[PDB]
């Protein structure tokens, strides 16, 4: 069911990095990773939590639809793209933490906790502050657990409405061309060691879907582009994308 391919480690070491890529072939129900241990080690989800958070906010009516405007609160932050109005699409594109913090406050502890249990999401533990637990609280998720969750979302099998799942998958749209579609979400965890970057999502082909989840050590922000670059080098090696 699971195959370890350490030849992918070259893609990390050539960039003076360490990490894990996990791939799942939906047609064949077979998984592949360079590091079975790290594939099952649990990390803070950081901004990858914007996927479940969006689903919960939509299903409870905290977010009406993907056009609703969340007005900038007028507090200047160090990420320029955060100092503006956003909707669900742009808030996910730019990983706009303060918008999702407000979602979490309106969701509340009780409903957030139950919904994460219904999703079987990671360790399902929201210990910490309700507006930051995915950044510095007790919640943890592994790369293999990200894949399990994403497969449910792809098949509209999560315990929220079909509409909520369709909207979040629209908001995850990252890249599309004549060869593939990528729906994904980046993450960057810095408040708790080890600092890591995430990229989780899937690649849609004409006749198959390949789910992926990667994380990697991220001692400085200088290496953030490697999250997508390393993943795509693996995808290219496996002839999933040209």
C-alpha positions as protocol buffer text, in pm:
chain_id: "A"
residue {
  index: 1
  type: UNK
  ca { x: 0 y: 0 z: 0 }
}
residue {
  index: 2
  type: UNK
  ca { x: 286 y: 233 z: 89 }
}
residue {
  index: 3
  type: UNK
  ca { x: 624 y: 259 z: -81 }
}
residue {
  index: 4
  type: UNK
  ca { x: 931 y: 449 z: 40 }
}
residue {
  index: 5
  type: UNK
  ca { x: 1142 y: 616 z: -232 }
}
residue {
  index: 6
  type: UNK
  ca { x: 1450 y: 775 z: -76 }
}
residue {
  index: 7
  type: UNK
  ca { x: 1571 y: 888 z: -420 }
}
residue {
  index: 8
  type: UNK
  ca { x: 1346 y: 1192 z: -368 }
}
residue {
  index: 9
  type: UNK
  ca { x: 1577 y: 1298 z: -81 }
}
residue {
  index: 10
  type: UNK
  ca { x: 1808 y: 1439 z: -349 }
}
residue {
  index: 11
  type: UNK
  ca { x: 1551 y: 1711 z: -416 }
}
residue {
  index: 12
  type: UNK
  ca { x: 1582 y: 1824 z: -54 }
}
residue {
  index: 13
  type: UNK
  ca { x: 1958 y: 1785 z: -6 }
}
residue {
  index: 14
  type: UNK
  ca { x: 2041 y: 1960 z: -335 }
}
residue {
  index: 15
  type: UNK
  ca { x: 1870 y: 2267 z: -184 }
}
residue {
  index: 16
  type: UNK
  ca { x: 2040 y: 2216 z: 156 }
}
residue {
  index: 17
  type: UNK
  ca { x: 1700 y: 2120 z: 298 }
}
residue {
  index: 18
  type: UNK
  ca { x: 1523 y: 1834 z: 477 }
}
residue {
  index: 19
  type: UNK
  ca { x: 1160 y: 1734 z: 455 }
}
residue {
  index: 20
  type: UNK
  ca { x: 900 y: 1489 z: 332 }
}
residue {
  index: 21
  type: UNK
  ca { x: 679 y: 1458 z: 28 }
}
residue {
  index: 22
  type: UNK
  ca { x: 380 y: 1223 z: 36 }
}
residue {
  index: 23
  type: UNK
  ca { x: 194 y: 1131 z: -284 }
}
residue {
  index: 24
  type: UNK
  ca { x: -128 y: 929 z: -322 }
}
residue {
  index: 25
  type: UNK
  ca { x: -239 y: 778 z: -655 }
}
residue {
  index: 26
  type: UNK
  ca { x: -618 y: 781 z: -633 }
}
residue {
  index: 27
  type: UNK
  ca { x: -675 y: 536 z: -920 }
}
residue {
  index: 28
  type: UNK
  ca { x: -434 y: 277 z: -779 }
}
residue {
  index: 29
  type: UNK
  ca { x: -487 y: 351 z: -406 }
}
residue {
  index: 30
  type: UNK
  ca { x: -111 y: 349 z: -356 }
}
residue {
  index: 31
  type: UNK
  ca { x: 100 y: 594 z: -159 }
}
residue {
  index: 32
  type: UNK
  ca { x: 462 y: 703 z: -196 }
}
residue {
  index: 33
  type: UNK
  ca { x: 698 y: 899 z: 29 }
}
residue {
  index: 34
  type: UNK
  ca { x: 1069 y: 964 z: 76 }
}
residue {
  index: 35
  type: UNK
  ca { x: 1048 y: 931 z: 455 }
}
residue {
  index: 36
  type: UNK
  ca { x: 789 y: 702 z: 614 }
}
residue {
  index: 37
  type: UNK
  ca { x: 871 y: 830 z: 963 }
}
residue {
  index: 38
  type: UNK
  ca { x: 840 y: 1201 z: 885 }
}
residue {
  index: 39
  type: UNK
  ca { x: 529 y: 1133 z: 674 }
}
residue {
  index: 40
  type: UNK
  ca { x: 361 y: 1031 z: 1002 }
}
residue {
  index: 41
  type: UNK
  ca { x: 512 y: 1296 z: 1233 }
}
residue {
  index: 42
  type: UNK
  ca { x: 261 y: 1559 z: 1346 }
}
residue {
  index: 43
  type: UNK
  ca { x: 321 y: 1932 z: 1302 }
}
residue {
  index: 44
  type: UNK
  ca { x: 128 y: 2252 z: 1356 }
}
residue {
  index: 45
  type: UNK
  ca { x: -92 y: 2297 z: 1046 }
}
residue {
  index: 46
  type: UNK
  ca { x: -41 y: 2675 z: 1036 }
}
residue {
  index: 47
  type: UNK
  ca { x: -215 y: 2823 z: 732 }
}
residue {
  index: 48
  type: UNK
  ca { x: -308 y: 2479 z: 594 }
}
residue {
  index: 49
  type: UNK
  ca { x: -578 y: 2502 z: 861 }
}
residue {
  index: 50
  type: UNK
  ca { x: -748 y: 2761 z: 641 }
}
residue {
  index: 51
  type: UNK
  ca { x: -899 y: 2463 z: 455 }
}
residue {
  index: 52
  type: UNK
  ca { x: -1099 y: 2320 z: 749 }
}
residue {
  index: 53
  type: UNK
  ca { x: -1157 y: 2670 z: 890 }
}
residue {
  index: 54
  type: UNK
  ca { x: -1314 y: 2784 z: 561 }
}
residue {
  index: 55
  type: UNK
  ca { x: -1538 y: 2475 z: 550 }
}
residue {
  index: 56
  type: UNK
  ca { x: -1665 y: 2529 z: 903 }
}
residue {
  index: 57
  type: UNK
  ca { x: -1721 y: 2902 z: 852 }
}
residue {
  index: 58
  type: UNK
  ca { x: -1923 y: 2839 z: 536 }
}
residue {
  index: 59
  type: UNK
  ca { x: -2130 y: 2553 z: 675 }
}
residue {
  index: 60
  type: UNK
  ca { x: -2229 y: 2753 z: 986 }
}
residue {
  index: 61
  type: UNK
  ca { x: -2309 y: 3070 z: 789 }
}
residue {
  index: 62
  type: UNK
  ca { x: -2022 y: 3271 z: 940 }
}
residue {
  index: 63
  type: UNK
  ca { x: -1920 y: 3320 z: 575 }
}
residue {
  index: 64
  type: UNK
  ca { x: -2212 y: 3369 z: 337 }
}
residue {
  index: 65
  type: UNK
  ca { x: -2029 y: 3289 z: 12 }
}
residue {
  index: 66
  type: UNK
  ca { x: -1699 y: 3348 z: -166 }
}
residue {
  index: 67
  type: UNK
  ca { x: -1797 y: 3707 z: -256 }
}
residue {
  index: 68
  type: UNK
  ca { x: -1862 y: 3835 z: 97 }
}
residue {
  index: 69
  type: UNK
  ca { x: -1614 y: 4114 z: 173 }
}
residue {
  index: 70
  type: UNK
  ca { x: -1421 y: 4102 z: 500 }
}
residue {
  index: 71
  type: UNK
  ca { x: -1320 y: 4464 z: 552 }
}
residue {
  index: 72
  type: UNK
  ca { x: -966 y: 4546 z: 663 }
}
residue {
  index: 73
  type: UNK
  ca { x: -975 y: 4640 z: 1029 }
}
residue {
  index: 74
  type: UNK
  ca { x: -746 y: 4936 z: 962 }
}
residue {
  index: 75
  type: UNK
  ca { x: -453 y: 4794 z: 1160 }
}
residue {
  index: 76
  type: UNK
  ca { x: -135 y: 4814 z: 955 }
}
residue {
  index: 77
  type: UNK
  ca { x: 39 y: 4476 z: 948 }
}
residue {
  index: 78
  type: UNK
  ca { x: 376 y: 4382 z: 801 }
}
residue {
  index: 79
  type: UNK
  ca { x: 223 y: 4180 z: 513 }
}
residue {
  index: 80
  type: UNK
  ca { x: 112 y: 4446 z: 265 }
}
residue {
  index: 81
  type: UNK
  ca { x: -147 y: 4221 z: 100 }
}
residue {
  index: 82
  type: UNK
  ca { x: -319 y: 4185 z: 439 }
}
residue {
  index: 83
  type: UNK
  ca { x: -385 y: 4563 z: 463 }
}
residue {
  index: 84
  type: UNK
  ca { x: -686 y: 4555 z: 233 }
}
residue {
  index: 85
  type: UNK
  ca { x: -1034 y: 4411 z: 196 }
}
residue {
  index: 86
  type: UNK
  ca { x: -1059 y: 4040 z: 119 }
}
residue {
  index: 87
  type: UNK
  ca { x: -1311 y: 3775 z: 24 }
}
residue {
  index: 88
  type: UNK
  ca { x: -1268 y: 3400 z: 75 }
}
residue {
  index: 89
  type: UNK
  ca { x: -1078 y: 3358 z: -252 }
}
residue {
  index: 90
  type: UNK
  ca { x: -822 y: 3632 z: -189 }
}
residue {
  index: 91
  type: UNK
  ca { x: -797 y: 3556 z: 184 }
}
residue {
  index: 92
  type: UNK
  ca { x: -684 y: 3206 z: 105 }
}
residue {
  index: 93
  type: UNK
  ca { x: -459 y: 3315 z: -183 }
}
residue {
  index: 94
  type: UNK
  ca { x: -272 y: 3556 z: 46 }
}
residue {
  index: 95
  type: UNK
  ca { x: -298 y: 3345 z: 367 }
}
residue {
  index: 96
  type: UNK
  ca { x: -467 y: 3633 z: 546 }
}
residue {
  index: 97
  type: UNK
  ca { x: -442 y: 3525 z: 910 }
}
residue {
  index: 98
  type: UNK
  ca { x: -647 y: 3808 z: 1068 }
}
residue {
  index: 99
  type: UNK
  ca { x: -951 y: 3728 z: 853 }
}
residue {
  index: 100
  type: UNK
  ca { x: -941 y: 3364 z: 961 }
}
residue {
  index: 101
  type: UNK
  ca { x: -884 y: 3460 z: 1324 }
}
residue {
  index: 102
  type: UNK
  ca { x: -1217 y: 3641 z: 1313 }
}
residue {
  index: 103
  type: UNK
  ca { x: -1379 y: 3335 z: 1153 }
}
residue {
  index: 104
  type: UNK
  ca { x: -1251 y: 3124 z: 1443 }
}
residue {
  index: 105
  type: UNK
  ca { x: -1386 y: 3364 z: 1706 }
}
residue {
  index: 106
  type: UNK
  ca { x: -1732 y: 3357 z: 1547 }
}
residue {
  index: 107
  type: UNK
  ca { x: -1722 y: 2978 z: 1510 }
}
residue {
  index: 108
  type: UNK
  ca { x: -1632 y: 2942 z: 1878 }
}
residue {
  index: 109
  type: UNK
  ca { x: -1454 y: 2669 z: 2073 }
}
residue {
  index: 110
  type: UNK
  ca { x: -1745 y: 2427 z: 2103 }
}
residue {
  index: 111
  type: UNK
  ca { x: -1842 y: 2415 z: 1735 }
}
residue {
  index: 112
  type: UNK
  ca { x: -1480 y: 2423 z: 1616 }
}
residue {
  index: 113
  type: UNK
  ca { x: -1390 y: 2124 z: 1833 }
}
residue {
  index: 114
  type: UNK
  ca { x: -1686 y: 1911 z: 1730 }
}
residue {
  index: 115
  type: UNK
  ca { x: -1635 y: 1987 z: 1362 }
}
residue {
  index: 116
  type: UNK
  ca { x: -1268 y: 1891 z: 1372 }
}
residue {
  index: 117
  type: UNK
  ca { x: -1369 y: 1562 z: 1535 }
}
residue {
  index: 118
  type: UNK
  ca { x: -1633 y: 1512 z: 1264 }
}
residue {
  index: 119
  type: UNK
  ca { x: -1357 y: 1573 z: 1007 }
}
residue {
  index: 120
  type: UNK
  ca { x: -1120 y: 1331 z: 1185 }
}
residue {
  index: 121
  type: UNK
  ca { x: -873 y: 1618 z: 1141 }
}
residue {
  index: 122
  type: UNK
  ca { x: -529 y: 1550 z: 1287 }
}
residue {
  index: 123
  type: UNK
  ca { x: -526 y: 1516 z: 1664 }
}
residue {
  index: 124
  type: UNK
  ca { x: -856 y: 1710 z: 1679 }
}
residue {
  index: 125
  type: UNK
  ca { x: -714 y: 1917 z: 1968 }
}
residue {
  index: 126
  type: UNK
  ca { x: -791 y: 2290 z: 1970 }
}
residue {
  index: 127
  type: UNK
  ca { x: -619 y: 2356 z: 2305 }
}
residue {
  index: 128
  type: UNK
  ca { x: -492 y: 2711 z: 2320 }
}
residue {
  index: 129
  type: UNK
  ca { x: -651 y: 3037 z: 2212 }
}
residue {
  index: 130
  type: UNK
  ca { x: -947 y: 2996 z: 1979 }
}
residue {
  index: 131
  type: UNK
  ca { x: -806 y: 3267 z: 1750 }
}
residue {
  index: 132
  type: UNK
  ca { x: -456 y: 3118 z: 1720 }
}
residue {
  index: 133
  type: UNK
  ca { x: -450 y: 2746 z: 1814 }
}
residue {
  index: 134
  type: UNK
  ca { x: -345 y: 2641 z: 1462 }
}
residue {
  index: 135
  type: UNK
  ca { x: -39 y: 2865 z: 1499 }
}
residue {
  index: 136
  type: UNK
  ca { x: 71 y: 2810 z: 1859 }
}
residue {
  index: 137
  type: UNK
  ca { x: -184 y: 2581 z: 2026 }
}
residue {
  index: 138
  type: UNK
  ca { x: -210 y: 2206 z: 2064 }
}
residue {
  index: 139
  type: UNK
  ca { x: -344 y: 2102 z: 1723 }
}
residue {
  index: 140
  type: UNK
  ca { x: -115 y: 1881 z: 1516 }
}
residue {
  index: 141
  type: UNK
  ca { x: -146 y: 1699 z: 1184 }
}
residue {
  index: 142
  type: UNK
  ca { x: 84 y: 1475 z: 980 }
}
residue {
  index: 143
  type: UNK
  ca { x: 139 y: 1471 z: 605 }
}
residue {
  index: 144
  type: UNK
  ca { x: -42 y: 1138 z: 575 }
}
residue {
  index: 145
  type: UNK
  ca { x: -330 y: 1281 z: 780 }
}
residue {
  index: 146
  type: UNK
  ca { x: -349 y: 1582 z: 547 }
}
residue {
  index: 147
  type: UNK
  ca { x: -394 y: 1344 z: 254 }
}
residue {
  index: 148
  type: UNK
  ca { x: -670 y: 1150 z: 432 }
}
residue {
  index: 149
  type: UNK
  ca { x: -856 y: 1476 z: 494 }
}
residue {
  index: 150
  type: UNK
  ca { x: -804 y: 1609 z: 139 }
}
residue {
  index: 151
  type: UNK
  ca { x: -934 y: 1287 z: -15 }
}
residue {
  index: 152
  type: UNK
  ca { x: -1258 y: 1327 z: 181 }
}
residue {
  index: 153
  type: UNK
  ca { x: -1288 y: 1689 z: 63 }
}
residue {
  index: 154
  type: UNK
  ca { x: -1226 y: 1591 z: -300 }
}
residue {
  index: 155
  type: UNK
  ca { x: -1506 y: 1330 z: -285 }
}
residue {
  index: 156
  type: UNK
  ca { x: -1747 y: 1564 z: -97 }
}
residue {
  index: 157
  type: UNK
  ca { x: -1745 y: 1313 z: 189 }
}
residue {
  index: 158
  type: UNK
  ca { x: -1679 y: 1555 z: 476 }
}
residue {
  index: 159
  type: UNK
  ca { x: -1966 y: 1614 z: 717 }
}
residue {
  index: 160
  type: UNK
  ca { x: -2052 y: 1958 z: 581 }
}
residue {
  index: 161
  type: UNK
  ca { x: -2272 y: 2045 z: 285 }
}
residue {
  index: 162
  type: UNK
  ca { x: -2169 y: 1973 z: -74 }
}
residue {
  index: 163
  type: UNK
  ca { x: -2188 y: 2348 z: -138 }
}
residue {
  index: 164
  type: UNK
  ca { x: -1938 y: 2427 z: 138 }
}
residue {
  index: 165
  type: UNK
  ca { x: -1693 y: 2172 z: -3 }
}
residue {
  index: 166
  type: UNK
  ca { x: -1731 y: 2300 z: -360 }
}
residue {
  index: 167
  type: UNK
  ca { x: -1667 y: 2658 z: -247 }
}
residue {
  index: 168
  type: UNK
  ca { x: -1353 y: 2566 z: -54 }
}
residue {
  index: 169
  type: UNK
  ca { x: -1218 y: 2365 z: -348 }
}
residue {
  index: 170
  type: UNK
  ca { x: -1275 y: 2670 z: -569 }
}
residue {
  index: 171
  type: UNK
  ca { x: -1082 y: 2882 z: -317 }
}
residue {
  index: 172
  type: UNK
  ca { x: -796 y: 2628 z: -322 }
}
residue {
  index: 173
  type: UNK
  ca { x: -740 y: 2676 z: -696 }
}
residue {
  index: 174
  type: UNK
  ca { x: -368 y: 2750 z: -736 }
}
residue {
  index: 175
  type: UNK
  ca { x: -269 y: 2660 z: -1093 }
}
residue {
  index: 176
  type: UNK
  ca { x: -437 y: 2538 z: -1411 }
}
residue {
  index: 177
  type: UNK
  ca { x: -321 y: 2480 z: -1766 }
}
residue {
  index: 178
  type: UNK
  ca { x: -386 y: 2237 z: -2047 }
}
residue {
  index: 179
  type: UNK
  ca { x: -200 y: 1959 z: -1862 }
}
residue {
  index: 180
  type: UNK
  ca { x: -316 y: 1972 z: -1499 }
}
residue {
  index: 181
  type: UNK
  ca { x: -503 y: 2159 z: -1226 }
}
residue {
  index: 182
  type: UNK
  ca { x: -356 y: 2213 z: -879 }
}
residue {
  index: 183
  type: UNK
  ca { x: -579 y: 2287 z: -580 }
}
residue {
  index: 184
  type: UNK
  ca { x: -366 y: 2342 z: -272 }
}
residue {
  index: 185
  type: UNK
  ca { x: -283 y: 2549 z: 34 }
}
residue {
  index: 186
  type: UNK
  ca { x: 54 y: 2661 z: 167 }
}
residue {
  index: 187
  type: UNK
  ca { x: 153 y: 2678 z: 530 }
}
residue {
  index: 188
  type: UNK
  ca { x: 436 y: 2839 z: 726 }
}
residue {
  index: 189
  type: UNK
  ca { x: 479 y: 2745 z: 1094 }
}
residue {
  index: 190
  type: UNK
  ca { x: 720 y: 2962 z: 1296 }
}
residue {
  index: 191
  type: UNK
  ca { x: 582 y: 2992 z: 1651 }
}
residue {
  index: 192
  type: UNK
  ca { x: 672 y: 2637 z: 1760 }
}
residue {
  index: 193
  type: UNK
  ca { x: 988 y: 2445 z: 1676 }
}
residue {
  index: 194
  type: UNK
  ca { x: 1077 y: 2305 z: 1433 }
}
residue {
  index: 195
  type: UNK
  ca { x: 987 y: 2586 z: 1192 }
}
residue {
  index: 196
  type: UNK
  ca { x: 842 y: 2431 z: 876 }
}
residue {
  index: 197
  type: UNK
  ca { x: 671 y: 2504 z: 548 }
}
residue {
  index: 198
  type: UNK
  ca { x: 374 y: 2306 z: 416 }
}
residue {
  index: 199
  type: UNK
  ca { x: 216 y: 2253 z: 78 }
}
residue {
  index: 200
  type: UNK
  ca { x: -86 y: 2022 z: 67 }
}
residue {
  index: 201
  type: UNK
  ca { x: -343 y: 1962 z: -204 }
}
residue {
  index: 202
  type: UNK
  ca { x: -382 y: 1762 z: -522 }
}
residue {
  index: 203
  type: UNK
  ca { x: -312 y: 1750 z: -894 }
}
residue {
  index: 204
  type: UNK
  ca { x: -609 y: 1683 z: -1122 }
}
residue {
  index: 205
  type: UNK
  ca { x: -535 y: 1504 z: -1450 }
}
residue {
  index: 206
  type: UNK
  ca { x: -770 y: 1398 z: -1730 }
}
residue {
  index: 207
  type: UNK
  ca { x: -792 y: 1043 z: -1592 }
}
residue {
  index: 208
  type: UNK
  ca { x: -653 y: 1044 z: -1235 }
}
residue {
  index: 209
  type: UNK
  ca { x: -595 y: 1258 z: -926 }
}
residue {
  index: 210
  type: UNK
  ca { x: -266 y: 1263 z: -734 }
}
residue {
  index: 211
  type: UNK
  ca { x: -294 y: 1390 z: -378 }
}
residue {
  index: 212
  type: UNK
  ca { x: 16 y: 1541 z: -218 }
}
residue {
  index: 213
  type: UNK
  ca { x: 131 y: 1668 z: 119 }
}
residue {
  index: 214
  type: UNK
  ca { x: 480 y: 1798 z: 192 }
}
residue {
  index: 215
  type: UNK
  ca { x: 655 y: 1972 z: 475 }
}
residue {
  index: 216
  type: UNK
  ca { x: 1013 y: 2087 z: 510 }
}
residue {
  index: 217
  type: UNK
  ca { x: 1242 y: 2264 z: 754 }
}
residue {
  index: 218
  type: UNK
  ca { x: 1214 y: 2642 z: 713 }
}
residue {
  index: 219
  type: UNK
  ca { x: 1473 y: 2817 z: 932 }
}
residue {
  index: 220
  type: UNK
  ca { x: 1417 y: 3145 z: 743 }
}
residue {
  index: 221
  type: UNK
  ca { x: 1153 y: 3275 z: 507 }
}
residue {
  index: 222
  type: UNK
  ca { x: 1417 y: 3274 z: 231 }
}
residue {
  index: 223
  type: UNK
  ca { x: 1327 y: 2915 z: 143 }
}
residue {
  index: 224
  type: UNK
  ca { x: 948 y: 2944 z: 115 }
}
residue {
  index: 225
  type: UNK
  ca { x: 949 y: 2906 z: -264 }
}
residue {
  index: 226
  type: UNK
  ca { x: 1104 y: 2562 z: -219 }
}
residue {
  index: 227
  type: UNK
  ca { x: 772 y: 2427 z: -90 }
}
residue {
  index: 228
  type: UNK
  ca { x: 623 y: 2436 z: -439 }
}
residue {
  index: 229
  type: UNK
  ca { x: 955 y: 2395 z: -622 }
}
residue {
  index: 230
  type: UNK
  ca { x: 1054 y: 2074 z: -444 }
}
residue {
  index: 231
  type: UNK
  ca { x: 703 y: 1930 z: -478 }
}
residue {
  index: 232
  type: UNK
  ca { x: 697 y: 1999 z: -850 }
}
residue {
  index: 233
  type: UNK
  ca { x: 1041 y: 1842 z: -899 }
}
residue {
  index: 234
  type: UNK
  ca { x: 902 y: 1525 z: -742 }
}
residue {
  index: 235
  type: UNK
  ca { x: 591 y: 1548 z: -960 }
}
residue {
  index: 236
  type: UNK
  ca { x: 813 y: 1591 z: -1267 }
}
residue {
  index: 237
  type: UNK
  ca { x: 1035 y: 1296 z: -1171 }
}
residue {
  index: 238
  type: UNK
  ca { x: 730 y: 1073 z: -1137 }
}
residue {
  index: 239
  type: UNK
  ca { x: 598 y: 1195 z: -1476 }
}
residue {
  index: 240
  type: UNK
  ca { x: 278 y: 1325 z: -1315 }
}
residue {
  index: 241
  type: UNK
  ca { x: 331 y: 1668 z: -1472 }
}
residue {
  index: 242
  type: UNK
  ca { x: 554 y: 1747 z: -1774 }
}
